[PDB]
Amino acid sequence: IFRSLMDGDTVLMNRPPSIHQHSLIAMTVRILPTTSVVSLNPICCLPFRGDFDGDCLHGYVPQSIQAKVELDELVALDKQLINRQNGRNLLSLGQDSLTAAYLVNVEKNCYLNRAQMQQLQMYCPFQLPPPAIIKASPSSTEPQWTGMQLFGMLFPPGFDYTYPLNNVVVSNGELLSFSEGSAWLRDGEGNFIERLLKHDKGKVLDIIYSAQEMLSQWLLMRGLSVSLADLYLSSDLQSRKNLTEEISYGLREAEQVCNKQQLMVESWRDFLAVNGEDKEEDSVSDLARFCYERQKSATLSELAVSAFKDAYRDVQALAYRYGDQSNSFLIMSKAGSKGNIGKLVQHSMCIGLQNSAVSLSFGFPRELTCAAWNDPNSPLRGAKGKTTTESYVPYGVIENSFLTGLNPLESFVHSVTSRDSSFS
Amino acid sequence: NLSELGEGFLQSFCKKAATSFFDKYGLISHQLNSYNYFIEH
Amino acid sequence: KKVSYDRDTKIINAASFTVEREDHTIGNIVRMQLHRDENVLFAGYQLPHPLKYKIIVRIHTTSQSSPMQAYNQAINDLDKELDYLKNQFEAEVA
Amino acid sequence: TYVCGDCGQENTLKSGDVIQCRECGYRILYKKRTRRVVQYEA
Amino acid sequence: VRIFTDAGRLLRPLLVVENLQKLKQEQYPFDHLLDHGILELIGIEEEEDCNTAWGIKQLLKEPKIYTHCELDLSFLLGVSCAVVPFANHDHGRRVLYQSQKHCQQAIGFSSTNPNIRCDTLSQQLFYPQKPLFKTLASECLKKEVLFNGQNAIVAVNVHLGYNQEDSIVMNKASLERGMFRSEQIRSYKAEVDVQFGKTHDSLEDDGFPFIGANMSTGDIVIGRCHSIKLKHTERGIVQKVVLSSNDEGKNFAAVSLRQVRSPCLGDKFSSMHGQKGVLGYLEEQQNFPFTIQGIVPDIVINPHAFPSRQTPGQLLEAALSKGIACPIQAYTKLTRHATPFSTPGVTEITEQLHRAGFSRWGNERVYNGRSGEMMRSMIFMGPTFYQRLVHMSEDKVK
Amino acid sequence: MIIPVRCFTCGKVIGNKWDQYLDLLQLDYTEGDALDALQLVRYCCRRMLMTHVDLIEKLLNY
Amino acid sequence: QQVLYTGKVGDARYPHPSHWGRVCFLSTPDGENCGLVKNMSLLGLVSTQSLESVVEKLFACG
Amino acid sequence: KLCGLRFMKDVLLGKRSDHTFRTVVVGDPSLKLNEIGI
Amino acid sequence: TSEKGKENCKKGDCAFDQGGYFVIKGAEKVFIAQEQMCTKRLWISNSPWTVSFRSENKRNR
Amino acid sequence: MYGDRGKRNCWTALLETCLPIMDMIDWGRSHPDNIRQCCSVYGIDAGRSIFVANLESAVSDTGKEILREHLLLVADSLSVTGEFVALNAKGWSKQRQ
Amino acid sequence: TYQRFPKIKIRELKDDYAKFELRETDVSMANALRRVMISEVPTVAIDLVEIEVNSSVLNDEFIAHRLGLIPLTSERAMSMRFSRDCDACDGDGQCEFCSVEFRLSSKCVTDQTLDVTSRDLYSADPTVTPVDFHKGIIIVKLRRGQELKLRAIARKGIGKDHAKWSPAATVTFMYEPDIIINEDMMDTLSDEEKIDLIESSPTKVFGMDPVTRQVVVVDPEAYTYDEEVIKKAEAMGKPGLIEISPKDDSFIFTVESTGAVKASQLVLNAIDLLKQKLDAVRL
RNA sequence: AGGAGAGGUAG
Ligand SMILES: [Mg+2]
Ligand SMILES: [Zn+2]
Ligand SMILES: [Zn+2]
Ligand SMILES: [Zn+2]
Known part of the structure; x- marks a missing residue:
């Protein structure tokens, strides 16, 4: 007495290893013409903590009727909507829906006409709002719809949402205001998905699915791409030269700040006091000794890296000044779907600080040039001869970026720094 | 003179020297030399 | 049945047409032809499942013509336009 | 029918012990492809 | 003073500027250069004493201070790493992956004499193609076997969310014309000291199937009288049967089965810069966002992979390949080399692409294939070089 | 490995242009001029005819 | 390079300035043998024992 | 290798069951969140 | 195979491998370089402080 | 403080050294940073509270968000027999004994 | 409207x-x-092939795939019926409406390499002859000997499938x-x-x-x-x-x-x- | 049919 698998049956999906109890999800079997492969919704990848790069999901088919009855009553997807770890929602918008919603709500200058709005209304479950834009020009007929009303067809009429931080007000199922931040869209304490789940908890999955489909259609209509202009991060060549000079000066200022911070020790208590010291020029002219002293001590290295991060936050802040609003990297960083600002800084302006975790027998020459690698007294050539040292804490700053091209010594420094992450 | 050779000439000479080195020793010659030395001596 | 008729109970003068074994090349032109009619209020098509070759067309009209009547009128107008284009191309090729 | 290696000669040997090519010395034989119709979908 | 003449020492050749002027006296063998002193072998301990210049351009700026010079900075890397374009423009982890795993797992030239080899799991691509870009190491080696794969038009855009989580969407029409289509030959070996025989469908009188027989699950491939039957996931068409014996008298039988492996949905493809993904969806040619001249993209990748994986230079590679391939409305003095430590500047690439008649940023205006409307944002397109890995879909089905 | 026919991208017939391309390269012609003389305005066909390697010669020899 | 235990090796898993031009520091297998297996560079040669006597030629130099 | 604690893990703690399938997964936004493509 | 003629090169090897392997039982075997300490240099270690002279052929450390 | 000799507790020696400056050090909030021996000085409850604080700090450093009841349950489970047993087999055996 | x-x-x-x-x-x-x-x-194109002798350096499926991509004259494509709709025959060799049979035979008896182009591909119907542009689309290259003989048929198909x-x-x-x-x-x-x-x-x-x-x-x-x-x-x-x-x-x-x-x-x-x-x- | 040595994939 055996029958083949068909639609409506439930299977227990699991991804090895099971790091949390939400990896076990019961899903209904849907037959597809594709063979030798299983199809999964991209949103459901977050509970499984996996991606589509070779991951294999092994399922379990329950044979007993009681096992099937208990499978969809306790281990089903709708039963696990509340995360048991932090109490928030388990399912998010995703890496694509988040960016699409950010682009819909941030632009506010692209109006959708009647045809496109009606085409996109097929996926949304709710009805069509009033156009709100009757005439945008003296000779413009065919009144259009704003972008924020398109996102308003994803909320029930009785759902009210307020987010003071991003100035987001949702009244009677209509989005009234939004400024920036994109924090309510992402997973958090006061995200809109959590409020929707706490409101009804009966149709949140369908709302999320329809929102994903509509946002995918809208982004296909718009189109998102990454080109060389995004990596250039400049309007023209003069802007690029100005940015390069500004980055160089910022790195020099950060190095000066680190050198100043290195003096906060008990050995320089006589110099830091408000008195008359004739050795003021000695602490400034000794520029090549500060790096050697930093690479030998661990507390000094920690102070130096902390000061470098504090002074390099301002350097990273220049991307919003030298970056346009149409930059794809900036859009994805502000939306929070993928990447951050430091990754963009390393992409375009400069990599920044590069330090290793464990101690090594060599130290970086602080310059990373052709003449530095040939210096017999450089820390990279075993020791600087200032008693002979045996161990060092590498500390290097890379002025170049990936777009310009890494120096071979800079590439060696980057490889030494990144070798730790490849260990088992 | 020092600069009488030119820049492009030195680049071409480097390429030709690399080609000659790859043609003489080949990609693998250390193992062959080690095995031949073990047979003769 | 290639074309299925299903009326909408929530909205009056609304219907859904399900066409099997069809692609965007027909739905797009049907939707664009339906927008020319003044009586048509909502006209659109969707392809929910790429694996399942089906096209769903939703037509909403005013209280002057049935959605099926507007659909047939749009089909006839598109056929006439195609015939006129064929005649123009045949005249130009000679 | 079996084709030899470096030597060109038809072996045509089906015995269990006959594995060596005649008047050749080498013991490497290749099976010859006969005239049979095979259908492929382009 | 320490002198070593023992074996096991590692050394590299370096150009010496003291005898560099002797070269110009109005194809040179390496032995002649070594005898004349133009080049010398420098050990690891000897290199610390001498002063070595990195590039030729840096040598002419300040002479009399560099004792030695390097032939090329790209030769410091390995054979599997120096051929990667824009190696220093990528993250270290991605370069490591490309030079360790994806290079070995690529499918390219198998051999030119498949009859003499009965190795297990031999895979060969139908139409291997050399990359558009040139590498100095590849030019000096004069071997096209370093690159294994084919180059296809790649557009960085979202396609209905079918390429999320670093997935890949390919063109159905391009694959059906012979792109990324490879064959797989698997050999089966049996040793007999019982004899070969049929002993009572496709087996002949000698105990082996004829060439051209379609073998399936549950069929005897080698008849001994025991017989060896194919397993659940073993299938193919008989290619050749090889019979051989050793001096001891033990008889060996080798049967090879060949089959065509078309790109399936579960197949995984890799790039030359560490980009890894599986095939997400097969889209028809009529639905792709064709450009102004009707060139549809063969492969579509998700833009979200670049900010996370941090792999610059793949866009540079695409722009360089597009500039090389596109015609000029004087083809000489065209930038083609992609030496990792001698990469051309971004401005040069933009100027080269602008002279070809396209946008300097590598993005072109495209039109939606489903509705015909023009997209608001330009999509970056470029013929990057991709590879096909040995991991398939049916090999993981259990 | 003979020239891949039909030029997968954009479906252009380039199966009979390899001999002409080799003949043009035998003379004092560059790759760009040789490809332009074959009436190829799209870079897909130029890529297909430029990235191909002749492997069948070694198959026939070896 | 052979080590006593696979869990910990020391500083051999990290690149060294002595790898300049001898072994590839940018490419290494990832896993248990991370950094233990090193790929040789393109311009890498291994010296062999010299049959000639160098002692006799050293006194002539001074 | 199958001795001591490994024996316990491979016999009593970890077991293998029938009616199980293992395949590679891909993305399909058209499918619902609670539905799995087979 | 070494120093073979033109006619002998056409039949046989595929000219894709330089021949660095071994044929033991039909499977290619390749040696991997073993990194060993230098035996002709004075070695100084710590904990405890000592200096050792390596042995060339006979154990005369 | 050095742990060369285990005969005397470090806190016991610290209290004797601070006799001239007993008023300066606020002994109402001073406590050892260790968890195992703090129960022998200030009781099991103080050790449990310090363990909860350290666990919250570790969770915050990890970047994840964990509810309070989980950490409280862990603390109450690891200190049910009046002492903080280890996670090894010996600790579980002692707890069961 | x-x-x-x-x-x-x-x-x-x-x-x-x-x-x-x-x-x-x-x-x-x-x-x-x-x-x-x-x-x-x-249009009309070769989809099914049947070879008898194939001793070339290339595989049979490789030759079938590069044969199926050869363009053919399709002046009768609108009048011909599909193979699945042709109820007069199950489909074997020449048919009146659906299938057009092609015959190819090449034997090299000279020292020079013989190039098998698309010109030496004969069919029963003169209206379904391959399009000649030139030397034609080369199929295979033959050394001394290495005969190639095959029989192929062409059917009407839509460009949606197999491209x-x-x-x-x-x-x-x-x-x-x-x-x-x-x-x-x-x-x-x-x-x-x-x-x-x-x-x-x-x-x-x-x-x-x-x-x-x-x-x-x-x-x-x-x-x-x-x-x-x-x-x-x-x-x-x-x-x-x-x-x-x-x-x-x-x-x-x-x-x-x-x-x-x-x-x-x-x-x-x-x-x-x-x-x-x-x-x-x-x- | 059963065990030992290598290489490889996913988090
Ligand atoms: Mg993964
Ligand atoms: Zn013989
Ligand atoms: Zn083309
Ligand atoms: Zn018929």
């Missing part, structure tokens, strides 16, 4: 190339016509943009700025008139919708210097055939097939 009135003007017409302009139509009609002529127009029955090649259409110049902000620009603006365009779309010292519009159909001149104008400080917008009701078609059918015949067949599909969809 009624039909449209397209206007067609032909600029250039050849056997395999046709460039004509379509006006007073929406983009949906042009896109649908392009899709129909690129994926719905049926080998598609006669179209790069069917494109543009919106035919119109260039608008205010002609008053150009007088404020200097002589050097005009040349800079001219050289900023990727393609030759703007021209310089020496007798008037002002820019002119020459060949506006090669703009390619690359927003480079507008960006340069914005950078120079003139926001409303050049305004370029696509035209919704004007289109220019570019149809290139593969040799199976004529381009004009391809367009006519696409129109007929679209009309038939609309009639079938009609309720």
Whole structure:
């Protein structure tokens, strides 16, 4: 007495290893013409903590009727909507829906006409709002719809949402205001998905699915791409030269700040006091000794890296000044779907600080040039001869970026720094 | 003179020297030399 | 049945047409032809499942013509336009 | 029918012990492809 | 003073500027250069004493201070790493992956004499193609076997969310014309000291199937009288049967089965810069966002992979390949080399692409294939070089 | 490995242009001029005819 | 390079300035043998024992 | 290798069951969140 | 195979491998370089402080 | 403080050294940073509270968000027999004994 | 609320190339016509082969795949019936309506390499002969001996599947943009700025008139919708210097055939097939 | 049929 698998049956999906109890999800079997492969919704990848790069999901088919009855009553997807770890929602918008919603709500200058709005209304479950834009020009007929009303067809009429931080007000199922931040869209304490789940908890999955489909259609209509202009991060060549000079000066200022911070020790208590010291020029002219002293001590290295991060936050802040609003990297960083600002800084302006975790027998020459690698007294050539040292804490700053091209010594420094992450 | 050779000439000479080195020793010659030395001596 | 008729109970003068074994090349032109009619209020098509070759067309009209009547009128107008284009191309090729 | 290696000669040997090519010395034989119709979908 | 003449020492050749002027006296063998002193072998301990210049351009700026010079900075890397374009423009982890795993797992030239080899799991691509870009190491080696794969038009855009989580969407029409289509030959070996025989469908009188027989699950491939039957996931068409014996008298039988492996949905493809993904969806040619001249993209990748994986230079590679391939409305003095430590500047690439008649940023205006409307944002397109890995879909089905 | 026919991208017939391309390269012609003389305005066909390697010669020899 | 235990090796898993031009520091297998297996560079040669006597030629130099 | 604690893990703690399938997964936004493509 | 003629090169090897392997039982075997300490240099270690002279052929450390 | 000799507790020696400056050090909030021996000085409850604080700090450093009841349950489970047993087999055996 | 009135003007017409302009139509009609002529127009091609002797260096499936991609004359593609619809025969060898049998036999008896092109491929029907451009499409290369004999048949198929029955090649259409110049902000620009603006365009779309010292519009159909001149104008400080917008009701078609059918015949067949599909969809 | 040595994939 055996029958083949068909639609409506439930299977227990699991991804090895099971790091949390939400990896076990019961899903209904849907037959597809594709063979030798299983199809999964991209949103459901977050509970499984996996991606589509070779991951294999092994399922379990329950044979007993009681096992099937208990499978969809306790281990089903709708039963696990509340995360048991932090109490928030388990399912998010995703890496694509988040960016699409950010682009819909941030632009506010692209109006959708009647045809496109009606085409996109097929996926949304709710009805069509009033156009709100009757005439945008003296000779413009065919009144259009704003972008924020398109996102308003994803909320029930009785759902009210307020987010003071991003100035987001949702009244009677209509989005009234939004400024920036994109924090309510992402997973958090006061995200809109959590409020929707706490409101009804009966149709949140369908709302999320329809929102994903509509946002995918809208982004296909718009189109998102990454080109060389995004990596250039400049309007023209003069802007690029100005940015390069500004980055160089910022790195020099950060190095000066680190050198100043290195003096906060008990050995320089006589110099830091408000008195008359004739050795003021000695602490400034000794520029090549500060790096050697930093690479030998661990507390000094920690102070130096902390000061470098504090002074390099301002350097990273220049991307919003030298970056346009149409930059794809900036859009994805502000939306929070993928990447951050430091990754963009390393992409375009400069990599920044590069330090290793464990101690090594060599130290970086602080310059990373052709003449530095040939210096017999450089820390990279075993020791600087200032008693002979045996161990060092590498500390290097890379002025170049990936777009310009890494120096071979800079590439060696980057490889030494990144070798730790490849260990088992 | 020092600069009488030119820049492009030195680049071409480097390429030709690399080609000659790859043609003489080949990609693998250390193992062959080690095995031949073990047979003769 | 290639074309299925299903009326909408929530909205009056609304219907859904399900066409099997069809692609965007027909739905797009049907939707664009339906927008020319003044009586048509909502006209659109969707392809929910790429694996399942089906096209769903939703037509909403005013209280002057049935959605099926507007659909047939749009089909006839598109056929006439195609015939006129064929005649123009045949005249130009000679 | 079996084709030899470096030597060109038809072996045509089906015995269990006959594995060596005649008047050749080498013991490497290749099976010859006969005239049979095979259908492929382009 | 320490002198070593023992074996096991590692050394590299370096150009010496003291005898560099002797070269110009109005194809040179390496032995002649070594005898004349133009080049010398420098050990690891000897290199610390001498002063070595990195590039030729840096040598002419300040002479009399560099004792030695390097032939090329790209030769410091390995054979599997120096051929990667824009190696220093990528993250270290991605370069490591490309030079360790994806290079070995690529499918390219198998051999030119498949009859003499009965190795297990031999895979060969139908139409291997050399990359558009040139590498100095590849030019000096004069071997096209370093690159294994084919180059296809790649557009960085979202396609209905079918390429999320670093997935890949390919063109159905391009694959059906012979792109990324490879064959797989698997050999089966049996040793007999019982004899070969049929002993009572496709087996002949000698105990082996004829060439051209379609073998399936549950069929005897080698008849001994025991017989060896194919397993659940073993299938193919008989290619050749090889019979051989050793001096001891033990008889060996080798049967090879060949089959065509078309790109399936579960197949995984890799790039030359560490980009890894599986095939997400097969889209028809009529639905792709064709450009102004009707060139549809063969492969579509998700833009979200670049900010996370941090792999610059793949866009540079695409722009360089597009500039090389596109015609000029004087083809000489065209930038083609992609030496990792001698990469051309971004401005040069933009100027080269602008002279070809396209946008300097590598993005072109495209039109939606489903509705015909023009997209608001330009999509970056470029013929990057991709590879096909040995991991398939049916090999993981259990 | 003979020239891949039909030029997968954009479906252009380039199966009979390899001999002409080799003949043009035998003379004092560059790759760009040789490809332009074959009436190829799209870079897909130029890529297909430029990235191909002749492997069948070694198959026939070896 | 052979080590006593696979869990910990020391500083051999990290690149060294002595790898300049001898072994590839940018490419290494990832896993248990991370950094233990090193790929040789393109311009890498291994010296062999010299049959000639160098002692006799050293006194002539001074 | 199958001795001591490994024996316990491979016999009593970890077991293998029938009616199980293992395949590679891909993305399909058209499918619902609670539905799995087979 | 070494120093073979033109006619002998056409039949046989595929000219894709330089021949660095071994044929033991039909499977290619390749040696991997073993990194060993230098035996002709004075070695100084710590904990405890000592200096050792390596042995060339006979154990005369 | 050095742990060369285990005969005397470090806190016991610290209290004797601070006799001239007993008023300066606020002994109402001073406590050892260790968890195992703090129960022998200030009781099991103080050790449990310090363990909860350290666990919250570790969770915050990890970047994840964990509810309070989980950490409280862990603390109450690891200190049910009046002492903080280890996670090894010996600790579980002692707890069961 | 009624039909449209397209206007067609032909600029250039050849056997395999046709460039004509379509006006007073929406983009949906042009896109649908392009899709129909690129994926719905049926042709004839080899799909099933049967070899007897194959001792070449190439595999059998490799030869079958490169045989199935050879273009064939498809003047009878509209009249022939599909194999699945041909109820008179199950399908074997020559048929009256569905299948056309092809025979090929090559034997090399000389020292020189024999090239098996597409010219020596004979069929029973003279109307389904392969298209000859030249030396023809080379199939295999044969040394001394190495005979190749095979039997193949051709069936009518749609270009949607296997991508080998598609006669179209790069069917494109543009919106035919119109260039608008205010002609008053150009007088404020200097002589050097005009040349800079001219050289900023990727393609030759703007021209310089020496007798008037002002820019002119020459060949506006090669703009390619690359927003480079507008960006340069914005950078120079003139926001409303050049305004370029696509035209919704004007289109220019570019149809290139593969040799199976004529381009004009391809367009006519696409129109007929679209009309038939609309009639079938009609309720 | 059963065990030992290598290489490889996913988090
Ligand atoms: Mg993964
Ligand atoms: Zn013989
Ligand atoms: Zn082409
Ligand atoms: Zn028939």
